[PDB]
Amino acid sequence: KPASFMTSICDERGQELIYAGMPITEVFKEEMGIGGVLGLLWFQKRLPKYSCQFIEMCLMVTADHGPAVSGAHNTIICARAGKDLVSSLTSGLLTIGDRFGGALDAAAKMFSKAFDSGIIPMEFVNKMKKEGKLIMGIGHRVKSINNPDMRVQILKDYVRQHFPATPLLDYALEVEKITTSKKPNLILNVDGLIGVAFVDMLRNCGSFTREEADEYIDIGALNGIFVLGRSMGFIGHYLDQKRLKQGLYRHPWDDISYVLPEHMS
Amino acid sequence: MKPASFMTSICDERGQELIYAGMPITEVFKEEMGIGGVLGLLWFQKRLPKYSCQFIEMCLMVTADHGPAVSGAHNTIICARAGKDLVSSLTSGLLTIGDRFGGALDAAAKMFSKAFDSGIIPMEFVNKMKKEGKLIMGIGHRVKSINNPDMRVQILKDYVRQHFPATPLLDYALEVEKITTSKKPNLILNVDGLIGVAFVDMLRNCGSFTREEADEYIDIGALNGIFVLGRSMGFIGHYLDQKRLKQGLYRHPWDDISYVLPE
Amino acid sequence: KPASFMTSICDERGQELIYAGMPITEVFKEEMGIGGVLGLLWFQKRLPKYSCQFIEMCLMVTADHGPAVSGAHNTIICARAGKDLVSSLTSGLLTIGDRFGGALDAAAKMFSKAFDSGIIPMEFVNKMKKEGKLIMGIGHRVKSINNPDMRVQILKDYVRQHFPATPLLDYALEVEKITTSKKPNLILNVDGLIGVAFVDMLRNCGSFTREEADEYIDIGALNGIFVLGRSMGFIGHYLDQKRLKQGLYRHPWDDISYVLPEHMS
Amino acid sequence: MKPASFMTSICDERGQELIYAGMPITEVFKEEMGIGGVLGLLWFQKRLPKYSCQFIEMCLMVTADHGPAVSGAHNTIICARAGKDLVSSLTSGLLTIGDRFGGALDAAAKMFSKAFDSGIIPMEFVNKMKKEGKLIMGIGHRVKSINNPDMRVQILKDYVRQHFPATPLLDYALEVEKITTSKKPNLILNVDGLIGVAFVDMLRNCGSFTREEADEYIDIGALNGIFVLGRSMGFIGHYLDQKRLKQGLYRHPWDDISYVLPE
Numbered sequence A, C: 001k002p003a004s005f006m007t008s009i010c011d012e013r014g015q016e017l018i019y020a021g022m023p024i025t026e027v028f029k030e031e032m033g034i035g036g037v038l039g040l041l042w043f044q045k046r047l048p049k050y051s052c053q054f055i056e057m058c059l060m061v062t063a064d065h066g067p068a069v070s071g072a073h074n075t076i077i078c079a080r081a082g083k084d085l086v087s088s089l090t091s092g093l094l095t096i097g098d099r100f101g102g103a104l105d106a107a108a109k110m111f112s113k114a115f116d117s118g119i120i121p122m123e124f125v126n127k128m129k130k131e132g133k134l135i136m137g138i139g140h141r142v143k144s145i146n147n148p149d150m151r152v153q154i155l156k157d158y159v160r161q162h163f164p165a166t167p168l169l170d171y172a173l174e175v176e177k178i179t180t181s182k183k184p185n186l187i188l189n190v191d192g193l194i195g196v197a198f199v200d201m202l203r204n205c206g207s208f209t210r211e212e213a214d215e216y217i218d219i220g221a222l223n224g225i226f227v228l229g230r231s232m233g234f235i236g237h238y239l240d241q242k243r244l245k246q247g248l249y250r251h252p253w254d255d256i257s258y259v260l261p262e263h264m265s
Numbered sequence B, D: 001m002k003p004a005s006f007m008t009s010i011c012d013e014r015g016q017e018l019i020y021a022g023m024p025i026t027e028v029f030k031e032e033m034g035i036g037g038v039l040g041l042l043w044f045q046k047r048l049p050k051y052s053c054q055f056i057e058m059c060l061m062v063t064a065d066h067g068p069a070v071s072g073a074h075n076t077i078i079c080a081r082a083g084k085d086l087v088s089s090l091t092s093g094l095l096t097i098g099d100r101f102g103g104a105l106d107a108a109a110k111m112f113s114k115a116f117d118s119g120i121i122p123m124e125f126v127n128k129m130k131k132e133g134k135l136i137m138g139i140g141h142r143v144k145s146i147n148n149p150d151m152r153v154q155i156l157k158d159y160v161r162q163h164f165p166a167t168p169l170l171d172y173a174l175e176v177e178k179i180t181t182s183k184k185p186n187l188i189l190n191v192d193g194l195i196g197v198a199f200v201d202m203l204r205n206c207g208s209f210t211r212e213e214a215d216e217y218i219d220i221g222a223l224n225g226i227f228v229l230g231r232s233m234g235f236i237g238h239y240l241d242q243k244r245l246k247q248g249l250y251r252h253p254w255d256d257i258s259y260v261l262p263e
């Protein structure tokens, strides 16, 4: 007779739905918004208004980055094969986590590890170069120190105007001053900014202990921010391919090098 | 020259700044578009009215979660307990969304619209569907009922009555609900049905679309996307919760399974 | 206290595993093979040896068809994004069912509907042409009447040598004689052959009633044959991309036409 | 000229007949390669010995299903009951395969090999893993135990002892199992562990690979593929069964869930 499952986030058993202790009518009366609902459902906290607005801005800036990236491309091909929305969205989401859409989480973890170890920025940069490890959340394929990324500028401006303390972002900005002295494109990118600003929120907004903040990073909250944000764009791409009446795709043979083993091997 | 193999119209990331439909990302923030406004741009290619953007955000908030017992949340919880990553776990749950659970918005919008547009009265629509052996999509619930009302539906209806210029399809669906609940108390107009018909009313009457454009967005399946994007927040919440609660591998009990194999 | 789930296919509760009434040791003693295990797990039948061998041949001929097709392409892109095997395989499997990997099921249903209605082949062809409906399981992008498909030839030869009755395949071959008189590439393709031969197996091997055979087609058994078969190739493609040390893919902008709405619209 | 963006080496479908690795499809059938031989070609790029091809097929047969209670079968059953299609339902279940359920073959092969290759004895390997807080991948089972042995393991061991030229890693793993089962009866060498270590023995000693090639196939994750491909047959079987049994939408009972929300 003991219960096999435990749950903490939502109670739908009563007359009125509850999100982490707040009845749904109170969620709307308090104007919590999507960011506030995320705070309740993911963290079981009532976050400050500025934190909720920051979460929403992260979801807006990660919403899409065009059709060429791995996941959008896969969703498109899946839509062009005549599949349903869920199948197409998930074909694209399944590309996320490592080389694509994984740098938010990896930047948070890497910069938090360096900061927490007490190593200064200049020594973190030299250590990573000696280990042959790229700094996660640094670098950009097209922007640079005097040609900035506007998503970085908008988010960074918000964080600096509203957050009372941003020690990890400050650390990452010192790292950026150093890396841009090796190559101008080694800027703090949007994945690096979201990653470090999200750690600064969890550690300093007042709703979490350090242990709680560290656990939410370790279990993948930043993978969730990118996944939830970019799901809007991937659904958009699915709908667009259907609106554009795009037919079945087959990749051209001229772009594929076939190098099979020898018959006699 | 070799013609392009792909065509796209929602987002251009090639230039100085990212563009969503007709708006550069700096303008998206200057105009305080919000998540609802970004959705209007990326899914509907329009800068929708503020009340429509707020309705979209309300839909995402009210669909965010409905507990761990429903098919998709349960499946996400199982993955999480099996030690999987966030994307795999979320996906395992999203893949349950369809005709019975969460994915009846497109079908509710289509079948209510078709009935309304044909001029048949609500009872004739109910009787016709029963004769054809077709369930009314957007009607019914396993646990909510006239004895246990859905506050999500109440919140959406109140917003829609206060802000939308006209709601003829919602009015028709509410007449269908009076008939179906009078037969059986769990045959309420559910969250899929409410959001489905209110989106038809919004698309047809907000002024951003022609009837042909509104009918196309319904045909291509945009409405189901609202539930999927909304409920993704709760499924990720369940994944995180199971990971924080250090919940171990689940195996369903044999006493809840009837094994009846051939002799 | 009543059980919430019902199951018919496998009992693992005892000392020895059972597949549809056969202990696993008996499955191997009787040399049932993969095809025989599929008969037990999918249909709860002990199929004839020739039927089991036919199932295995279907899985072998559908195992792969190169890297250019939708699902293999998506699995490849997912592997190149550094994802795990399951995520990459399922990103590709999620493209299956309609325009890609859906014709086995659709050919079985379409040819069974025509056959069961009593319409002769010539009249089925004319009806489909008047309705503007392509015949599922007919047509080939590269092969034709005097340039045959070898997978079709191998499977068809097996079926005709071992099956005592093949009425649906016979019907489909009459349709092929007619369609190849309009255009030489309107041959019976491997999806059409598997589809109709699978119906002939279910209806005439002696293990199923007509009602049972029709239900297995309706619930998607042929979607299962292609999915299970092609999963071997998609896993192969995942492994190959890792063996070849292939990096993150991003589709080239020169192959994408960006046609966004006007700023003032 | 524009260099090719994709590279491939397992299958060529451009010509007169389909080619799998080094063999045209007509030769695959003339040589009676079977499913195991096709897997050897597509995954390992080799025409493997007949006993290795038969071992591969045995692995696919013994992993085909293990009932409806395990994580992935349960999730597939939920999708099927939610009215979803075969691919979505199969996928929802496959996405549970990983470190705890079904996907410990790669990790078992790597950790047993590393321990064996280092020269440490089986007890030192057990004690080291316990000190590091690392579970021994390929050991343990929720329901099979020394009191309830796994006949799949017995069948695989018997085949491997009768046909393989040498099985040093399996012999080491069986010594680890004597230690772990002596501590707790459910710490058996499970199907993931058996298949994992027997594949290392097969890759290292069948004669088709160098040690470097064998170590690479283990590193890139080929062994887990065996479970995924094998168990896909059972998950599709469960999908079909639920559809034939006309099983309706499932919702987990509230009495089996402890809701503990913040105050």
Ligand SMILES: CC(C)(COP(=O)(O)OP(=O)(O)OC[C@H]1O[C@@H](n2cnc3c(N)ncnc32)[C@H](O)[C@@H]1OP(=O)(O)O)[C@@H](O)C(=O)NCCC(=O)NCCS
Pocket (backbone or CB within 6 Å): A103, A133, A134, A135, A136, A137, A138, A139, A140, A141, A183, A185, A186, A189, A191, A192
């Ligand atoms: C985005 C990225 C791929 C751009 O790299 P790139 O400009 O193509 O760089 P290359 O690989 O050609 O290397 C150029 C040089 O800069 C260095 N470099 C590039 N990115 C670096 C980083 N993130 N940290 C440290 N050094 C970096 C390389 O080590 C190399 O130095 P070398 O000339 O002494 O060998 C890369 O910076 C990166 O992987 N960043 C981390 C992941 C990330 O944050 N991604 C999110 C944005 S997509």
Ligand SMILES: CC(C)(COP(=O)(O)OP(=O)(O)OC[C@H]1O[C@@H](n2cnc3c(N)ncnc32)[C@H](O)[C@@H]1OP(=O)(O)O)[C@@H](O)C(=O)NCCC(=O)NCCS
Pocket (backbone or CB within 6 Å): B099, B100, B101, B102, B103, B104, B134, B135, B136, B137, B138, B139, B140, B141, B142, B143, B184, B186, B187, B190, B192, B193, D248, D249
């Ligand atoms: C959600 C749903 C599965 C709940 O069903 P339920 O409360 O468990 O009801 P049951 O499946 O036990 O059906 C009970 C009776 O109501 C009927 N019924 C249930 N849903 C109905 C619908 N949408 N339209 C018409 N009749 C319906 C059944 O046919 C049955 O009637 P009977 O006495 O003639 O056999 C079902 O209402 C449904 O499929 N609705 C449509 C899909 C939808 O909108 N889903 C979103 C909500 S999860």
Ligand SMILES: CC(C)(COP(=O)(O)OP(=O)(O)OC[C@H]1O[C@@H](n2cnc3c(N)ncnc32)[C@H](O)[C@@H]1OP(=O)(O)O)[C@@H](O)C(=O)NCCC(=O)NCCS
Pocket (backbone or CB within 6 Å): C103, C133, C134, C135, C136, C137, C138, C139, C140, C141, C183, C185, C186, C189, C191, C192
């Ligand atoms: C495989 C396939 C795409 C090849 O088509 P194709 O040679 O490119 O044909 P097109 O679309 O250019 O049409 C050429 C003509 O042949 C006809 N045609 C092509 N395939 C046909 C079919 N399956 N049934 C009937 N007529 C067919 C077209 O109607 C057209 O006739 P028209 O000139 O009178 O208008 C097509 O035959 C098809 O969709 N088949 C059904 C699906 C299937 O079985 N696929 C599995 C193999 S991929």
Ligand SMILES: CC(C)(COP(=O)(O)OP(=O)(O)OC[C@H]1O[C@@H](n2cnc3c(N)ncnc32)[C@H](O)[C@@H]1OP(=O)(O)O)[C@@H](O)C(=O)NCCC(=O)NCCS
Pocket (backbone or CB within 6 Å): B248, B249, D099, D100, D101, D102, D103, D104, D134, D135, D136, D137, D138, D139, D140, D141, D142, D143, D184, D186, D187, D190, D192, D193
């Ligand atoms: C499969 C598995 C979840 C079953 O676990 P279980 O029978 O439910 O056991 P529990 O999780 O209750 O653990 C009971 C005890 O055995 C230990 N144990 C379980 N699996 C162990 C393993 N593989 N290595 C070492 N110790 C193990 C636990 O640490 C615990 O010991 P404690 O008394 O010190 O706390 C677990 O054995 C495991 O994760 N194995 C490795 C993964 C694997 O091979 N999976 C394939 C089989 S499904």
